From a paper:
Here we explore peptide inhibitors of [name], a substrate-recognition subunit and activator of the E3 ubiquitin ligase the anaphase-promoting complex/cyclosome (APC/C) that is essential in mitosis and consequently of interest as an anti-cancer target. APC/C engages substrates via degrons that include the ‘destruction box’ (D-box) motif. The D-box binding site comprises a cleft between two of the beta-propeller blades and the neighbouring APC/C subunit APC10, which is thought to result in stabilisation of the active complex. We used a rational design approach to construct binders containing unnatural amino acids aimed at better filling a hydrophobic pocket that contributes to the D-box binding site on the surface of [name].
We incorporated (S)–2-amino-4,4-dimethylpentanoic acid (C3) into the backbone sequences of D4, D10, and D19 replacing leucine at position 4, yielding peptides D7, D12, and D20, respectively. As expected, the structure–activity relationship (SAR) held true between all peptides, whereby incorporation of the unnatural amino acid increased the binding affinity over 6-fold versus the respective parental peptide. Building on this success, we further explored the commercially available halogenated analog, (S)–2-amino-4,4,4-trifluorobutanoic acid (F3), leading to peptide [name]. With the tri-fluorinated group, a further increase in binding affinity was achieved (KD = 520 ± 10 nM), which is similar to that of Apcin. We attempted these soaking experiments with our four highest affinity peptides, [name], D20, D7, and D19 (in order of highest affinity to lowest) and were able to observe sufficient ligand density for all but D19. The crystal structures of Cdc20WD40 in complex with each of the other three D-box peptides show that they bound to Cdc20WD40 at the canonical D-box degron binding site, with a largely similar topology to the S. cerevisiae Acm1-Cdh1 structure (overlay of [name] with Acm1 D-box). The nitrogen backbone atom of the (S)–2-amino-4,4,4-trifluorobutanoic acid/(S)–2-amino-4,4-dimethylpentanoic acid unnatural amino acids also forms a hydrogen bond with the carbonyl of Asp177. Interestingly, the observed electron density of the peptide correlates with [name] binding affinity: [name] and D20, having the highest affinities, display the clearest electron density allowing six amino acids to be modelled, whereas D7 shows relatively poor density permitting modelling of only four residues.
Residue numbers in the entry:
A (entry chain A): 166 to 476
B (entry chain B): 1 to 6
The structure:
Amino acid sequence: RYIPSLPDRILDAPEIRNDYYLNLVDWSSGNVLAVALDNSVYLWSASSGDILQLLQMEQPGEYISSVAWIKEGNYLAVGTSSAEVQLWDVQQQKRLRNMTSHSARVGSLSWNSYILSSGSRSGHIHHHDVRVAEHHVATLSGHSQEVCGLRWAPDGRHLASGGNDNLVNVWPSAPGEGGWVPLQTFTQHQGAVKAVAWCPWQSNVLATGGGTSDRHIRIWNVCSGACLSAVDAHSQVCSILWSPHYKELISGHGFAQNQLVIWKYPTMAKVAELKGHTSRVLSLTMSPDGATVASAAADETLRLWRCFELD
Amino acid sequence: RAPXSD
């Protein structure tokens, strides 16, 4: 099939924080990209090109460490270096909540309906019921280093977390009659696990990717614990996304090519490489229609690749 | 340098 070698758009990302553990971009279901640039969050509306500076941190030294849109795309969660998880109403351009519970920066976020999960440099994960006064309703403690990858499954049955302690934990959706203990703890990656993404068409299938000392993409069945595939990507794997339309995966990388790689699933054959970034890719996010992948990189650009469409 | 500009 034909995949374009050039991105559809190249957006300037001046002062993007070149910190591997942060999750600074997210594309909403309303087709709006949220981009954290140092101490500000900018919103770019894909259909119009309109840009809004949603917010700016008020204290010296403060920076944004994560952003995640709620499913409906009307609220944006913003994790900060000052251990805050802010909830912003983007229609009103106003902060609704400034939730404190963490002891260190919140570099990862993931929503499950009205529950927002947040991962911290402390290694703890907190569940926040954003609708209520005492938002902090659960603490999941399965990491000894920064939680850099955090992702609820699309069916809400599991939550995956990856850390700078080289672990992947798969958590249940509720503590039930027992406590908050992982259903699975995968120790096979020999590096930080920032890349965490669930297969959209198979409930229990998860893809994870390790850092520079690991370089592998691993596919798991979280029910059986099976490692279905382990492929060497020859670089750190910052992100992974699945195309639900093409049955493919796309991963972002660092040294030496700073490229995106498209893989055919389930064969894991290399389909294409998207080159152009001049410094390591930091994060990937997908458009709500599944056609475009935005890659944010340490070269201060956001490249938007229409790699899953011909129109 | 304008943030998010083309």
